[PDB]
Design an enzyme around this catalytic site. Structure first.
Site, short mmCIF file in Angstrom:
data_model
loop_
_atom_site.label_atom_id
_atom_site.label_comp_id
_atom_site.label_asym_id
_atom_site.label_seq_id
_atom_site.Cartn_x
_atom_site.Cartn_y
_atom_site.Cartn_z
N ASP A 134 63.75 56.86 39.82
CA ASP A 134 63.15 55.46 40.10
C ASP A 134 62.42 54.85 38.84
O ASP A 134 61.37 54.65 38.75
CB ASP A 134 61.93 55.69 41.16
N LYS A 136 61.54 52.24 36.23
CA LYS A 136 61.31 50.73 36.34
C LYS A 136 59.94 50.62 35.27
O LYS A 136 59.41 51.49 35.09
CB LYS A 136 60.91 50.35 38.00
N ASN A 139 56.64 52.20 36.36
CA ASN A 139 56.60 53.83 36.00
C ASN A 139 56.52 54.28 34.52
O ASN A 139 56.75 55.38 34.08
CB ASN A 139 57.83 54.66 36.71
N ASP A 152 56.02 59.43 37.47
CA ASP A 152 56.46 59.45 38.73
C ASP A 152 57.76 60.39 39.09
O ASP A 152 58.72 59.68 39.18
CB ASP A 152 56.67 57.79 39.04
N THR A 165 63.16 51.84 44.10
CA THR A 165 63.16 50.40 44.01
C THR A 165 64.11 49.81 44.00
O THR A 165 64.96 49.60 43.40
CB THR A 165 61.98 50.15 43.21
N1 BI3 Z 1 50.97 51.62 39.64
C1 BI3 Z 1 51.08 52.78 38.95
C2 BI3 Z 1 52.55 53.63 39.35
C3 BI3 Z 1 52.94 54.87 38.28
N2 BI3 Z 1 51.99 55.98 38.22
C4 BI3 Z 1 51.18 55.87 37.27
C5 BI3 Z 1 50.53 57.02 37.17
C6 BI3 Z 1 49.59 57.39 36.05
C7 BI3 Z 1 48.79 56.78 35.47
C8 BI3 Z 1 48.11 55.59 35.98
C9 BI3 Z 1 47.77 54.56 34.96
N3 BI3 Z 1 47.37 53.55 35.48
C10 BI3 Z 1 47.76 53.58 37.15
C11 BI3 Z 1 47.54 52.58 38.08
C12 BI3 Z 1 48.06 52.98 39.37
C13 BI3 Z 1 48.40 54.34 39.84
C14 BI3 Z 1 48.31 55.30 38.56
C15 BI3 Z 1 48.28 54.70 37.45
C16 BI3 Z 1 48.05 57.34 34.67
O1 BI3 Z 1 47.16 56.98 33.85
N4 BI3 Z 1 48.87 58.52 34.42
C17 BI3 Z 1 49.73 58.68 35.45
O2 BI3 Z 1 50.74 59.54 35.49
C18 BI3 Z 1 51.36 57.85 38.03
C19 BI3 Z 1 51.17 59.20 38.39
C20 BI3 Z 1 52.26 59.70 39.33
C21 BI3 Z 1 52.98 58.73 39.90
C22 BI3 Z 1 53.25 57.56 39.64
C23 BI3 Z 1 52.11 57.08 38.78
#
Ligand code: BI3
Length: 277
Positions: A134, A136, A139, A152, A165
């Site tokens: 996944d 992108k 991530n 992710d 996606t």
């Molecule tokens: N929209 C962000 C989606 C990706 N994503 C960010 C995170 C992480 C972070 C995020 C940092 N900004 C974010 C906004 C929305 C959701 C997650 C985060 C972060 O600081 N460290 C992460 O691993 C995350 C963790 C597990 C699975 C997916 C993750």
């Protein structure tokens, strides 16, 4: 020995960074150290009811095995009666998608630098026999120093039940229903195209229409697309999965890293280099 198992009480939870179907990521500051972590919280009952235990388990196990600067780090885990908590790196500059939207098309120097870090990260991941599935811009996080940190991993595969996606899905995933390193390389081609053009290559009104364009390799390059970058994308977005630059059948990461688009790249220490501003 290992540090004492942590617990909710050890942290001051702050804002929610984001919310998914089976988890929520919340910013938390550890009281004993003042350190900030992005803590992913999953409700056990929901994971069980939806048969997600293999995925949650996979996320933890894959992340435990990674030890490279271009990946988000899993620092600790713990659980209470209702939830599972995963302590992760807090990437202060958010995700690459935000950056692409914020600035639009990247110039060639910025495209090269970030593409090289992603390639370097994939080389490490595939070297361990792990496929992301996944990949992108959403991530691919940016740390405080603007270097990438990929995250992710619950949907990763350790070397045909998951499809990522829509815009980044490979043709083989739509035809044969099977996971290969080639799918990550296809995603990489889409991402390079997106950094240069400002948008991914396959776009349409709904998923079905996107998949249709993918299987027919229906996309085109905008005017002024850096010639060497276009050549590289054309060598990644190839319907025949075994012919993509980076595949073992094409002799691996060596030929990919040697592509003319990367001529000025020093691969050995990207993480110590200053990202172009
Ligand atoms: N929209 C962000 C989606 C990706 N994503 C960010 C995170 C992480 C972070 C995020 C940092 N900004 C974010 C906004 C929305 C959701 C997650 C985060 C972060 O600081 N460290 C992460 O691993 C995350 C963790 C597990 C699975 C997916 C993750």
């Amino acid at each position: 020995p290992q540090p004492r198992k942590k617990r909710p009480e050890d942290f001051k939870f702050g804002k929610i960074l984001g919310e998914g179907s089976f988890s929520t990521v919340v910013l938390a500051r550890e009281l004993a150290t003042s350190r900030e972590y992005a803590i992913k919280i999953l409700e056990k009952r929901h994971i069980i009811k939806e048969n997600k235990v293999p995925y949650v388990t996979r996320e933890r196990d894959v992340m435990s095995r990674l030890d490279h600067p271009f990946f988000v780090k899993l620092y600790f885990t713990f659980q209470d009666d209702e939830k599972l908590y995963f302590g992760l790196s807090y990437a202060k500059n958010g995700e690459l998608l935000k950056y692409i939207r914020k600035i639009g098309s990247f110039d060639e120097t910025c495209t090269r630098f970030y593409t090289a870090e992603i390639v370097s990260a994939l080389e490490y991941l595939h070297g361990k026999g792990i496929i992301h599935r996944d990949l992108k811009p959403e991530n691919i996080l940016l740390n405080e120093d603007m270097h990438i940190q990929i995250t992710d991993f619950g949907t990763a595969k350790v070397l045909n039940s998951f499809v990522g996606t829509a815009q980044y899905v490979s043709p083989e995933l739509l035809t044969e229903k099977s996971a290969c390193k080639s799918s990550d390389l296809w995603a990489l081609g889409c991402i390079i195209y997106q950094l240069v053009a400002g948008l991914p290559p396959f776009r349409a009104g709904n998923e079905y229409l996107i998949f249709q364009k993918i299987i027919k390799l229906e996309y085109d390059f905008p005017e002024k697309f850096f010639p060497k970058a276009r050549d590289l994308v054309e060598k990644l977005l190839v319907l025949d999965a075994t012919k993509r630059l980076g595949c073992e059948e094409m002799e691996g990461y060596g030929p990919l890293k040697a592509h003319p688009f990367f001529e000025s790249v020093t691969w050995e220490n990207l993480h110590q280099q200053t990202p172009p501003k």
